[PDB]
Structure formats: structure tokens, C-alpha cells
């Protein structure tokens, strides 16, 4: 119920999901040429 926890839950959940793509940050955008 308090937003601060709600976002921590979301973060920790999302954070803890598998890395289907370790191509990091800028190559995802099609911008490594």
C-alpha cells in the first residue's frame, strides 16, 4: 500500500527476471553498426 514499497517490489521482481539479452544499453536500439 505505500508507494515506496510498491516500487521496490516492482524493481526487485523485474531485476530478478532472466537476462534474455545481455546486449547492453545501445545495441538494442540498433546503434552499434
Amino acid at each position: 500500500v505505500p508507494l515506496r514499497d510498491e516500487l521496490a517490489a516492482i524493481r526487485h521482481r523485474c531485476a530478478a527476471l532472466p537476462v534474455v539479452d545481455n546486449r547492453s544499453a545501445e545495441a538494442i536500439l540498433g546503434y552499434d553498426e
Binding site: 508507494l3 515506496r4 510498491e6 516500487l7 521496490a8 516492482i10 524493481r11 526487485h12 521482481r13 523485474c14 531485476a15 527476471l17 532472466p18 537476462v19 534474455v20 539479452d21 546486449r23 544499453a25 538494442i28 536500439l29
Partner: protein, 128 residues
């Protein structure tokens, strides 16, 4: 009021070292905006990294923070376009221009992390 940049959301959604400090700042300001192109950018970076279950967590974060997704109108693109002459590249990339544009037309401070928005004519939300 605030505006948020993808650099921030992605920091939070990827459990980056600072992440807690951004939550505290998001929590402290109850009115929040994001450009649809900065929302779109996160989406691609999250969904690529974690799959659509990541996307799901993005959509849920946005829903609870009640974040305003603001259309990228002509006026913002201009300010962005103009700024980049001054602050592009040691500065902004094409993607940063969207959060940049919204902050200046809104006149609202920008929550980001990293270097790209360090030295620019728009205010910043500082961390607590």
C-alpha cells in the same frame, strides 16, 4: 512536478546501485511526466533485456506512479533541436532530446542518471 528520463526508469527497473535514491525522489514528487519517446525507449531496453515480463513490470511501475505520458509536440522538438547545437555531441544523444524537450516546454526539473544531462539550461531533480 517532475519529468523522468529513461536513464532513471532503467536504473530503477534493473536494480542499479542508486535505485533506492530515485524511488525516494519519485515518492517525494506526486506529479510526474514522461515523453512517449522516453517511455518508448525504456520499453525497448527493458523488453529486450527481460522479455515482455519486463514490459509487464514497466507497465505496472508506470501505472502505480501515475506517470503522465506526454505527446512529443512540435514545440518540444524545436527546443530539443536548438539545444543540441549547444549541448549535443560530451552531452545529449538523440534519445535524451525527448526528455530534454518536455522539461523545457514544461519548465519542470528532469530526473536522470549519468552524464548526459549534467551541463544544460534545464533544472534537475536532485537525489535525497
Amino acid at each position: 512536478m517532475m519529468v523522468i528520463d529513461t536513464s532513471a526508469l532503467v536504473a530503477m527497473l534493473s536494480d542499479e546501485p542508486d535505485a533506492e535514491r530515485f524511488e525516494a525522489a519519485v515518492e517525494a514528487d506526486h506529479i510526474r511526466l514522461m515523453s512517449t519517446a522516453s517511455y518508448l525507449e525504456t520499453a525497448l531496453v527493458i523488453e529486450a533485456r527481460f522479455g515482455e515480463p519486463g514490459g509487464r513490470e514497466l507497465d505496472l511501475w508506470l501505472h502505480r506512479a501515475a506517470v503522465d505520458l506526454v505527446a512529443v509536440h512540435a514545440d518540444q522538438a524545436d527546443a530539443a533541436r536548438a539545444a543540441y547545437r549547444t549541448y549535443g555531441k560530451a552531452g545529449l544523444n538523440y534519445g535524451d532530446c525527448f526528455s530534454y524537450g518536455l522539461a523545457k516546454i514544461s519548465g519542470q526539473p528532469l530526473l536522470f542518471k549519468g552524464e548526459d544531462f549534467q551541463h544544460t539550461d534545464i533544472a534537475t531533480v536532485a537525489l535525497p
